[PDB]
Coordinates of C-alpha atoms in Angstrom, one line a residue:
Chain Y
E119 CA 53.2 80.6 -35.7
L120 CA 51.4 78.6 -38.9
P121 CA 48.2 78.0 -35.8
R122 CA 49.6 79.3 -32.5
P123 CA 58.4 96.4 -60.6
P124 CA 59.3 96.9 -57.1
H125 CA 60.4 93.6 -55.0
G126 CA 57.6 92.6 -52.7
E127 CA 59.9 92.0 -49.8
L128 CA 60.0 96.1 -50.0
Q129 CA 56.0 95.6 -48.2
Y130 CA 57.4 94.1 -45.0
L131 CA 60.6 96.3 -44.7
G132 CA 58.1 99.3 -45.3
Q133 CA 56.0 98.2 -42.7
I134 CA 58.7 97.1 -40.1
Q135 CA 59.6 101.0 -40.7
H136 CA 56.1 102.3 -40.0
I137 CA 55.7 100.5 -37.1
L138 CA 59.2 101.8 -35.5
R139 CA 57.9 105.6 -36.6
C140 CA 54.5 105.1 -35.8
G141 CA 53.5 102.1 -33.6
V142 CA 52.1 102.8 -30.1
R143 CA 53.4 100.9 -26.8
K144 CA 51.4 98.1 -25.9
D145 CA 51.4 95.4 -24.0
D146 CA 50.7 91.7 -24.7
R147 CA 49.4 88.6 -22.9
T148 CA 52.7 88.1 -20.8
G149 CA 52.8 91.7 -20.2
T150 CA 55.5 92.2 -22.4
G151 CA 56.4 95.9 -24.4
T152 CA 55.9 95.6 -28.1
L153 CA 55.6 98.4 -30.6
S154 CA 51.8 98.5 -32.1
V155 CA 49.7 99.1 -35.7
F156 CA 46.5 97.9 -36.0
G157 CA 45.6 96.9 -39.3
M158 CA 48.2 96.0 -42.0
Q159 CA 48.3 94.3 -45.9
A160 CA 50.7 93.2 -48.4
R161 CA 50.6 91.0 -51.8
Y162 CA 53.5 88.9 -52.7
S163 CA 53.0 87.8 -56.0
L164 CA 53.9 83.6 -56.8
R165 CA 53.5 84.0 -60.6
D166 CA 57.5 82.1 -61.3
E167 CA 58.4 83.1 -58.0
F168 CA 58.6 82.4 -54.3
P169 CA 58.4 85.0 -51.6
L170 CA 61.1 83.8 -49.1
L171 CA 62.5 86.8 -47.5
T172 CA 66.1 87.5 -48.3
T173 CA 66.9 90.4 -46.0
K174 CA 67.1 87.4 -43.5
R175 CA 67.7 83.6 -43.9
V176 CA 64.4 82.6 -43.2
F177 CA 64.5 78.6 -41.8
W178 CA 62.9 77.3 -45.1
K179 CA 63.6 73.5 -44.0
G180 CA 61.5 74.2 -40.7
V181 CA 58.5 75.9 -42.3
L182 CA 58.7 73.0 -44.9
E183 CA 58.4 70.5 -42.2
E184 CA 55.9 72.2 -39.8
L185 CA 53.6 72.4 -42.5
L186 CA 53.8 68.8 -43.5
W187 CA 53.0 68.0 -39.8
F188 CA 49.9 70.2 -40.3
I189 CA 48.6 68.5 -43.0
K190 CA 48.8 65.2 -41.5
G191 CA 46.7 66.3 -38.4
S192 CA 49.2 65.7 -35.3
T193 CA 49.0 66.1 -32.0
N194 CA 52.4 64.0 -31.1
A195 CA 54.5 66.6 -30.6
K196 CA 57.7 63.8 -31.0
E197 CA 56.8 63.7 -34.9
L198 CA 58.0 67.0 -35.6
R199 CA 53.3 77.4 -23.5
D200 CA 50.7 78.1 -21.0
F201 CA 47.6 75.5 -22.6
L202 CA 50.5 73.0 -21.2
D203 CA 48.8 73.9 -17.7
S204 CA 45.3 72.3 -19.1
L205 CA 47.1 68.4 -20.0
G206 CA 47.2 65.6 -17.5
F207 CA 50.8 64.3 -16.5
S208 CA 51.2 60.7 -18.3
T209 CA 49.9 62.5 -21.5
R210 CA 52.0 65.3 -21.9
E211 CA 55.4 62.9 -21.0
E212 CA 54.5 61.2 -23.9
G213 CA 54.3 64.3 -26.5
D214 CA 50.3 63.6 -26.9
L215 CA 49.1 67.5 -27.1
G216 CA 45.2 67.0 -27.2
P217 CA 42.9 68.2 -30.0
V218 CA 45.1 70.8 -31.5
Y219 CA 47.0 72.4 -34.6
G220 CA 46.2 70.6 -37.6
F221 CA 43.4 68.6 -35.7
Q222 CA 41.6 71.7 -36.6
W223 CA 42.7 71.2 -39.9
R224 CA 41.6 68.0 -40.5
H225 CA 39.5 66.7 -38.1
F226 CA 37.7 69.9 -36.8
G227 CA 35.1 69.4 -33.8
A228 CA 35.9 65.5 -33.4
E229 CA 35.7 64.1 -29.8
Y230 CA 39.7 63.7 -29.4
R231 CA 41.1 61.0 -27.8
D232 CA 44.3 60.2 -28.2
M233 CA 47.5 60.9 -30.5
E234 CA 47.4 57.9 -31.8
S235 CA 43.5 57.0 -32.2
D236 CA 42.0 56.8 -35.7
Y237 CA 40.2 59.9 -36.5
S238 CA 39.1 59.2 -40.0
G239 CA 35.7 60.5 -41.2
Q240 CA 35.3 62.0 -38.0
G241 CA 35.0 65.8 -37.7
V242 CA 35.0 68.3 -40.4
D243 CA 38.4 68.1 -42.8
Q244 CA 38.7 72.0 -43.5
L245 CA 41.7 71.3 -46.0
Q246 CA 40.2 68.4 -48.4
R247 CA 36.8 70.6 -48.1
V248 CA 39.0 73.8 -49.4
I249 CA 40.7 71.5 -52.5
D250 CA 36.9 70.0 -52.9
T251 CA 35.6 73.4 -53.4
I252 CA 38.2 74.5 -55.6
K253 CA 37.2 71.5 -58.0
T254 CA 33.3 71.8 -57.9
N255 CA 32.9 75.6 -58.0
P256 CA 36.1 77.7 -58.5
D257 CA 34.3 81.0 -58.3
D258 CA 32.8 79.8 -55.1
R259 CA 33.6 82.9 -52.5
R260 CA 33.7 81.0 -49.4
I261 CA 37.1 78.8 -50.1
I262 CA 37.7 79.3 -46.3
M263 CA 39.9 77.5 -43.7
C264 CA 40.9 78.6 -40.2
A265 CA 43.4 77.9 -37.6
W266 CA 43.1 78.4 -33.4
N267 CA 45.8 78.8 -31.1
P268 CA 45.9 75.5 -29.1
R269 CA 45.3 77.8 -25.6
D270 CA 41.9 79.5 -26.7
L271 CA 39.6 75.9 -27.6
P272 CA 39.1 75.1 -23.7
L273 CA 38.9 78.7 -22.7
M274 CA 35.5 79.7 -24.0
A275 CA 32.5 78.6 -26.0
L276 CA 32.9 79.7 -30.0
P277 CA 36.4 81.0 -29.2
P278 CA 37.9 83.1 -32.1
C279 CA 40.0 81.8 -34.6
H280 CA 43.7 82.7 -34.8
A281 CA 44.2 82.9 -38.3
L282 CA 41.9 82.6 -41.6
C283 CA 42.6 81.2 -45.0
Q284 CA 40.7 82.6 -47.8
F285 CA 41.3 81.4 -51.4
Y286 CA 40.1 82.8 -54.5
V287 CA 40.4 81.1 -58.2
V288 CA 40.5 82.7 -61.3
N289 CA 41.9 82.8 -64.9
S290 CA 43.3 79.4 -63.5
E291 CA 44.9 80.6 -60.8
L292 CA 44.9 80.3 -57.5
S293 CA 45.6 83.0 -55.1
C294 CA 45.4 82.8 -50.8
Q295 CA 44.3 85.5 -48.0
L296 CA 46.0 84.8 -44.6
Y297 CA 43.7 87.4 -42.3
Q298 CA 45.7 86.8 -38.7
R299 CA 44.2 88.4 -35.7
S300 CA 48.1 89.6 -34.2
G301 CA 51.0 89.2 -36.5
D302 CA 55.3 89.0 -34.6
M303 CA 56.6 91.1 -37.6
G304 CA 59.9 90.3 -36.5
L305 CA 59.8 86.8 -36.1
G306 CA 56.6 85.0 -37.1
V307 CA 54.8 87.1 -40.3
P308 CA 58.1 86.4 -42.4
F309 CA 58.0 82.4 -41.3
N310 CA 54.3 82.7 -42.1
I311 CA 54.2 84.1 -45.7
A312 CA 56.4 81.4 -46.4
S313 CA 54.3 78.5 -44.9
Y314 CA 50.9 79.8 -46.3
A315 CA 52.6 80.7 -49.4
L316 CA 53.9 77.0 -49.6
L317 CA 50.1 75.5 -49.0
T318 CA 49.3 77.7 -51.7
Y319 CA 51.6 76.1 -54.2
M320 CA 50.7 72.8 -53.0
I321 CA 47.0 73.1 -53.2
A322 CA 47.7 74.8 -56.8
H323 CA 49.7 71.7 -57.7
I324 CA 47.0 69.5 -56.7
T325 CA 44.4 71.0 -58.6
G326 CA 46.0 72.1 -61.3
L327 CA 45.9 75.3 -61.3
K328 CA 49.0 78.3 -61.4
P329 CA 49.8 80.0 -58.1
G330 CA 49.1 84.1 -58.0
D331 CA 49.1 86.0 -55.4
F332 CA 49.5 85.4 -51.5
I333 CA 47.7 88.3 -49.4
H334 CA 48.4 88.8 -45.7
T335 CA 46.7 91.1 -43.5
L336 CA 47.0 91.6 -39.7
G337 CA 45.2 92.5 -36.8
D338 CA 47.6 93.8 -34.3
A339 CA 51.0 93.9 -36.3
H340 CA 53.8 94.4 -33.6
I341 CA 57.1 94.6 -32.9
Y342 CA 58.6 93.1 -29.6
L343 CA 60.8 95.5 -28.1
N344 CA 63.8 93.5 -28.0
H345 CA 63.5 93.0 -31.6
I346 CA 64.1 96.5 -32.6
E347 CA 67.8 97.1 -32.8
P348 CA 67.7 93.8 -35.1
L349 CA 65.2 95.1 -37.2
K350 CA 66.9 98.3 -37.8
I351 CA 70.0 96.9 -38.8
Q352 CA 68.0 94.4 -41.7
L353 CA 65.9 97.5 -43.1
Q354 CA 69.3 98.8 -43.9
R355 CA 69.8 95.7 -45.7
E356 CA 68.4 95.4 -49.9
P357 CA 66.3 92.4 -51.1
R358 CA 67.8 90.2 -53.6
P359 CA 65.6 88.2 -56.2
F360 CA 63.1 86.0 -54.5
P361 CA 63.9 82.6 -55.3
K362 CA 61.6 80.0 -57.4
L363 CA 60.0 77.0 -55.6
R364 CA 59.8 74.2 -57.7
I365 CA 57.8 70.3 -56.8
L366 CA 60.1 67.5 -58.1
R367 CA 57.1 64.8 -58.9
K368 CA 53.5 64.9 -59.9
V369 CA 51.9 64.6 -57.0
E370 CA 47.8 63.4 -57.0
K371 CA 46.6 64.1 -53.6
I372 CA 47.5 66.9 -50.5
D373 CA 48.7 63.9 -48.3
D374 CA 50.7 62.6 -50.7
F375 CA 53.6 65.6 -50.1
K376 CA 57.0 64.5 -48.7
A377 CA 59.3 67.1 -47.6
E378 CA 61.9 65.8 -50.6
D379 CA 59.4 66.6 -53.1
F380 CA 60.1 70.5 -52.8
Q381 CA 63.4 72.4 -53.9
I382 CA 64.4 75.9 -53.5
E383 CA 66.3 77.5 -55.9
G384 CA 68.6 80.4 -56.2
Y385 CA 67.9 81.6 -52.7
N386 CA 71.1 84.2 -51.5
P387 CA 69.4 85.6 -48.9
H388 CA 71.6 88.3 -46.6
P389 CA 73.3 86.6 -43.0
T390 CA 71.1 85.0 -40.5
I391 CA 69.3 87.6 -37.8
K392 CA 68.7 85.9 -34.3
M393 CA 65.6 87.8 -32.6
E394 CA 65.5 86.9 -29.4
Chain H
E747 CA 24.5 93.2 -46.2
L748 CA 25.7 94.1 -42.6
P749 CA 25.6 90.0 -42.4
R750 CA 24.1 89.0 -45.5
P751 CA 46.3 115.0 -45.4
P752 CA 44.0 113.3 -48.3
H753 CA 40.2 112.9 -47.5
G754 CA 40.1 109.3 -46.6
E755 CA 37.1 108.5 -49.4
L756 CA 40.3 108.7 -52.0
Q757 CA 40.9 105.4 -50.9
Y758 CA 37.3 104.2 -51.9
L759 CA 37.9 105.9 -55.2
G760 CA 41.1 104.4 -56.1
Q761 CA 39.9 101.1 -55.4
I762 CA 37.0 101.6 -58.1
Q763 CA 39.1 102.6 -60.4
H764 CA 42.0 99.8 -59.8
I765 CA 39.0 97.2 -60.4
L766 CA 37.8 99.2 -63.6
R767 CA 41.4 99.0 -65.3
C768 CA 42.7 95.9 -63.4
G769 CA 39.6 93.5 -62.0
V770 CA 39.0 90.1 -63.8
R771 CA 35.8 88.9 -64.8
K772 CA 34.0 86.1 -63.0
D773 CA 30.9 85.0 -62.5
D774 CA 28.9 85.2 -58.6
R775 CA 26.2 82.6 -57.2
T776 CA 23.9 83.3 -59.5
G777 CA 26.1 83.5 -62.7
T778 CA 26.2 87.2 -63.2
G779 CA 29.0 89.2 -64.2
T780 CA 31.6 90.8 -62.2
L781 CA 34.7 92.4 -62.3
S782 CA 36.5 91.4 -59.5
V783 CA 39.9 92.2 -58.0
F784 CA 41.2 89.4 -54.7
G785 CA 42.5 91.2 -51.5
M786 CA 42.0 95.4 -50.5
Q787 CA 42.0 97.1 -47.6
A788 CA 41.1 100.7 -46.5
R789 CA 41.6 102.9 -43.5
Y790 CA 39.1 105.5 -42.3
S791 CA 39.6 107.7 -39.3
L792 CA 37.2 108.3 -36.9
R793 CA 38.6 110.9 -34.9
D794 CA 36.1 113.7 -35.0
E795 CA 34.6 112.6 -38.1
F796 CA 32.3 109.8 -39.5
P797 CA 33.4 108.0 -42.9
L798 CA 29.5 108.6 -44.6
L799 CA 30.7 108.6 -48.5
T800 CA 30.2 112.1 -50.1
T801 CA 30.4 111.2 -53.5
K802 CA 26.8 109.7 -53.6
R803 CA 24.0 110.4 -50.8
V804 CA 24.4 107.2 -48.8
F805 CA 21.2 106.0 -47.0
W806 CA 22.1 106.6 -43.5
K807 CA 18.9 106.3 -41.9
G808 CA 18.5 102.8 -43.5
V809 CA 22.1 102.1 -42.0
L810 CA 21.1 102.9 -38.5
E811 CA 18.1 101.0 -38.3
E812 CA 19.3 98.1 -39.7
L813 CA 22.1 97.9 -37.4
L814 CA 19.9 98.7 -34.5
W815 CA 17.5 95.8 -35.7
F816 CA 21.1 93.2 -35.6
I817 CA 21.7 94.7 -32.1
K818 CA 18.1 93.7 -30.9
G819 CA 18.8 89.9 -32.3
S820 CA 15.8 90.2 -34.3
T821 CA 14.7 87.2 -36.6
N822 CA 11.6 89.1 -37.5
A823 CA 11.3 90.8 -40.8
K824 CA 8.1 92.8 -39.9
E825 CA 10.7 94.6 -37.5
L826 CA 12.4 96.0 -40.1
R827 CA 16.6 85.5 -51.2
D828 CA 17.6 81.7 -51.7
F829 CA 17.6 80.5 -47.9
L830 CA 13.7 81.5 -47.9
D831 CA 13.8 78.2 -49.7
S832 CA 14.4 76.2 -46.8
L833 CA 11.7 78.0 -44.7
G834 CA 8.0 76.6 -44.1
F835 CA 4.7 78.0 -45.5
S836 CA 3.7 79.2 -42.6
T837 CA 6.5 80.7 -40.7
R838 CA 8.0 83.0 -44.0
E839 CA 4.1 84.3 -44.1
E840 CA 4.3 86.1 -40.5
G841 CA 8.1 87.4 -41.3
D842 CA 9.9 84.3 -39.4
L843 CA 13.3 84.4 -41.2
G844 CA 14.7 81.4 -38.6
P845 CA 18.1 81.6 -36.6
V846 CA 19.5 84.0 -38.9
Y847 CA 21.0 87.8 -38.7
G848 CA 21.7 89.2 -35.5
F849 CA 20.4 86.3 -34.0
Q850 CA 24.2 84.8 -34.2
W851 CA 25.6 88.3 -32.5
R852 CA 23.1 88.0 -29.5
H853 CA 22.1 84.2 -29.4
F854 CA 24.8 82.6 -31.7
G855 CA 24.2 78.4 -31.4
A856 CA 21.1 78.7 -29.5
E857 CA 18.3 75.7 -30.3
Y858 CA 16.0 78.0 -32.5
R859 CA 12.3 77.6 -31.4
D860 CA 10.2 81.2 -33.1
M861 CA 10.8 84.7 -33.3
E862 CA 9.0 85.6 -30.9
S863 CA 10.5 82.9 -28.8
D864 CA 12.7 84.4 -25.3
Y865 CA 16.1 83.6 -25.4
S866 CA 18.1 85.5 -22.9
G867 CA 20.9 83.6 -21.4
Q868 CA 21.0 81.4 -25.0
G869 CA 24.2 81.1 -26.8
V870 CA 26.8 83.2 -27.2
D871 CA 26.0 86.4 -27.0
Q872 CA 29.3 87.7 -29.2
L873 CA 28.2 91.5 -28.9
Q874 CA 28.1 91.5 -24.7
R875 CA 31.1 89.6 -25.1
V876 CA 33.1 92.1 -27.1
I877 CA 32.1 94.8 -24.9
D878 CA 32.7 92.8 -21.4
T879 CA 36.7 91.9 -23.0
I880 CA 37.3 95.9 -24.0
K881 CA 36.5 96.0 -19.7
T882 CA 38.3 93.1 -19.0
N883 CA 41.7 93.2 -20.9
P884 CA 41.6 96.1 -23.4
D885 CA 44.7 94.2 -25.0
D886 CA 43.1 91.6 -26.0
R887 CA 43.9 90.3 -29.3
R888 CA 40.7 88.2 -29.5
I889 CA 38.3 91.1 -29.4
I890 CA 36.5 89.5 -32.5
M891 CA 32.6 88.8 -34.0
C892 CA 31.4 87.4 -36.9
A893 CA 28.3 87.3 -39.3
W894 CA 27.5 84.6 -41.3
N895 CA 25.1 85.0 -44.2
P896 CA 21.9 83.0 -43.5
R897 CA 22.3 81.0 -46.9
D898 CA 25.1 79.2 -45.4
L899 CA 23.8 78.2 -41.6
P900 CA 22.3 75.0 -43.0
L901 CA 24.4 74.1 -46.2
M902 CA 27.1 72.4 -44.1
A903 CA 28.9 71.7 -40.8
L904 CA 31.1 74.1 -39.5
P905 CA 29.9 76.8 -42.1
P906 CA 32.5 80.0 -43.2
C907 CA 31.1 83.5 -41.6
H908 CA 30.6 86.3 -44.1
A909 CA 32.4 88.8 -42.1
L910 CA 34.4 89.1 -39.3
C911 CA 35.2 92.3 -37.2
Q912 CA 38.3 92.7 -34.5
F913 CA 38.3 95.7 -32.3
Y914 CA 41.5 97.1 -31.0
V915 CA 42.2 99.3 -28.1
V916 CA 44.9 101.1 -27.2
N917 CA 45.9 105.2 -25.4
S918 CA 41.8 104.6 -24.7
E919 CA 41.4 105.0 -28.7
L920 CA 38.5 102.1 -29.7
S921 CA 39.5 101.0 -33.6
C922 CA 37.7 98.1 -35.8
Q923 CA 38.8 95.9 -38.4
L924 CA 36.1 94.4 -40.4
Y925 CA 36.8 91.5 -43.1
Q926 CA 34.1 90.3 -45.8
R927 CA 35.0 87.5 -47.9
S928 CA 33.5 89.2 -50.8
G929 CA 32.6 93.3 -51.3
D930 CA 30.3 94.6 -53.8
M931 CA 31.6 98.0 -54.2
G932 CA 29.1 99.9 -55.9
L933 CA 26.3 99.0 -53.0
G934 CA 27.3 97.1 -50.4
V935 CA 30.7 98.5 -49.6
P936 CA 29.5 102.2 -48.5
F937 CA 26.5 100.7 -46.6
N938 CA 29.1 98.4 -44.5
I939 CA 31.7 101.0 -44.1
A940 CA 29.4 103.5 -42.8
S941 CA 27.6 100.1 -40.5
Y942 CA 30.5 99.2 -39.0
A943 CA 31.6 102.6 -38.2
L944 CA 28.3 103.4 -36.6
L945 CA 28.9 100.2 -34.6
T946 CA 32.1 101.6 -33.2
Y947 CA 30.9 104.7 -32.1
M948 CA 28.0 102.5 -30.0
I949 CA 30.8 100.7 -28.5
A950 CA 33.1 103.1 -27.7
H951 CA 30.3 105.4 -26.0
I952 CA 29.3 103.0 -23.9
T953 CA 33.0 101.4 -22.7
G954 CA 33.9 105.5 -22.4
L955 CA 36.8 105.3 -25.1
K956 CA 37.1 107.3 -28.1
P957 CA 36.5 106.1 -31.7
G958 CA 40.1 105.8 -33.5
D959 CA 40.4 103.6 -37.0
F960 CA 37.9 101.6 -39.3
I961 CA 39.7 99.3 -41.3
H962 CA 38.2 97.3 -44.2
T963 CA 39.4 94.2 -46.0
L964 CA 38.1 92.4 -48.5
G965 CA 38.6 89.4 -50.3
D966 CA 37.0 89.6 -54.0
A967 CA 36.2 92.8 -54.1
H968 CA 34.3 93.2 -57.3
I969 CA 31.7 95.6 -59.5
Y970 CA 28.6 94.3 -61.2
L971 CA 29.0 94.7 -64.9
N972 CA 25.7 96.7 -64.7
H973 CA 27.3 99.4 -61.9
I974 CA 30.1 100.2 -64.4
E975 CA 28.7 103.2 -65.8
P976 CA 27.7 104.5 -62.9
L977 CA 30.4 104.3 -60.9
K978 CA 32.6 105.9 -64.0
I979 CA 30.7 109.2 -63.4
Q980 CA 30.9 108.5 -59.2
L981 CA 34.3 109.1 -59.9
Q982 CA 34.8 112.3 -61.5
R983 CA 33.1 113.7 -58.3
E984 CA 35.3 114.9 -55.4
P985 CA 34.5 114.4 -52.1
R986 CA 33.6 116.7 -49.6
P987 CA 34.8 116.9 -45.8
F988 CA 33.0 113.9 -43.8
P989 CA 30.4 114.8 -41.6
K990 CA 30.5 114.5 -37.8
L991 CA 28.2 111.9 -35.9
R992 CA 26.4 113.1 -32.3
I993 CA 25.5 110.9 -30.1
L994 CA 22.8 112.9 -27.9
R995 CA 22.4 111.3 -24.7
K996 CA 24.6 109.6 -22.2
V997 CA 23.9 105.2 -23.1
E998 CA 25.2 102.8 -20.3
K999 CA 24.4 99.5 -22.3
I1000 CA 24.3 98.6 -25.8
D1001 CA 20.5 97.1 -26.1
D1002 CA 19.4 100.9 -24.6
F1003 CA 20.4 103.0 -28.4
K1004 CA 17.4 104.1 -30.0
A1005 CA 18.0 106.0 -33.6
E1006 CA 16.9 109.1 -32.4
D1007 CA 20.0 109.1 -30.4
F1008 CA 22.2 109.6 -33.2
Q1009 CA 22.4 113.2 -35.1
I1010 CA 24.6 113.5 -38.2
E1011 CA 26.0 117.0 -38.6
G1012 CA 27.5 118.8 -41.8
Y1013 CA 26.8 115.9 -44.2
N1014 CA 27.0 117.7 -47.8
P1015 CA 27.3 114.7 -50.5
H1016 CA 26.9 114.8 -54.2
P1017 CA 23.7 113.6 -55.3
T1018 CA 21.8 110.1 -55.3
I1019 CA 23.0 106.9 -57.5
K1020 CA 21.0 104.5 -58.3
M1021 CA 22.7 101.0 -58.7
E1022 CA 20.6 98.3 -60.2

């Protein structure tokens, strides 16, 4: 879902508990019920640990592979659902998603042609722009990259982003705040926490900084009715110490990171939970 | 600065105290020193009270008059500082600010001509769009309006916003979350709290909802070195009960609110503090 001292995981569990006791019933787009709270934040340190949640096994290899696909700016689904309605027959066969996802991170606003076209120098590269500013002005308060839900792009002019990520630099540490307009607490939030924390380590590595904190803010923080019973069970589990993330080579540019450059260590989560 | 149970004010004072003890030295744009913390949030109820801070007298009449000017979409400064460098001689005489401030709330992206031109139907009206969506789909998670620092608009393509405001509706209550990329804790934050809370009441009134909560999130939350001594003094003051805000007529449209439609009641703040 990345476009579409007390243990830090206690924040997450406390937020689950708060939505369960205090959330109000509210329908999503499809008319499916949620318990919802408006406005929440949590901070997770990245210093010498990596916030892969331990109360359930998080799909780390999937976090990593989806982020690397976003970074590459891909619109080929094969390299890796109402917006599909706006695609032609021929093109959604072959896996062409149109100008969506990492296309906005790397080529925001470029005239789209096809998923095998050459978009070098076309549109705003938000990602490289973030990295260049970290290097030219670390005090900058504008070090911001947004992601859109693909469904929204042709829906209106100036469509609101889904997520905005702000970076912040001080004492040679890089920190990241991700504000998401809505957050599926059971499924999306853990995956997103790992995803933006991983991006934070990648760019700290290339800019020669140290990871600092990851802050997650959310608008409509919600639990799907279906997820209530498994989440109640996850709450009674005790967090284990966060693992470490180790980058195994010196890497010079963002586009040069490969999935096997990363190693997670000392990850001992509780068993997987399947959320509908 | 709107484009450019325990008392809720305790949040604010606690945030001041945290920056004082835990903030790190960081320079702003001009090379002026701050104490800074990355990532902060506070919630203020709007139910039957209005969060005009009481530990110092807040300039309420100024909050009100600036918001009404933004709402009108004005670029005439007379109707009410590095970006001034990009203005011609003739035009910054007569008070023409160019396509800046409420121009983005009411005519985002319209080709600018002059501050007395007629922009009806030109560009995206973010404000009316927020109100129309509250009325057509209250569950919408996309009820978002952004504001830009005028300095940033011609600085780059796709310039990051300064503030994003998200609205949220449930049980016929309207709530608002304002995320600002940087927040001047001494001067801007109190004024902004009152400003977005006032906007929240105005739109709740026109959409027939009730005000709910106002949530303030900030990126780089900072105290100017100069403000440290007066803020230390403000901290030792005890908050008085928040006042009420009373709207004195039934008003049908956003553009129809006049400054004398509002009355603040039972406001008994501590004395004014002048922050440099």
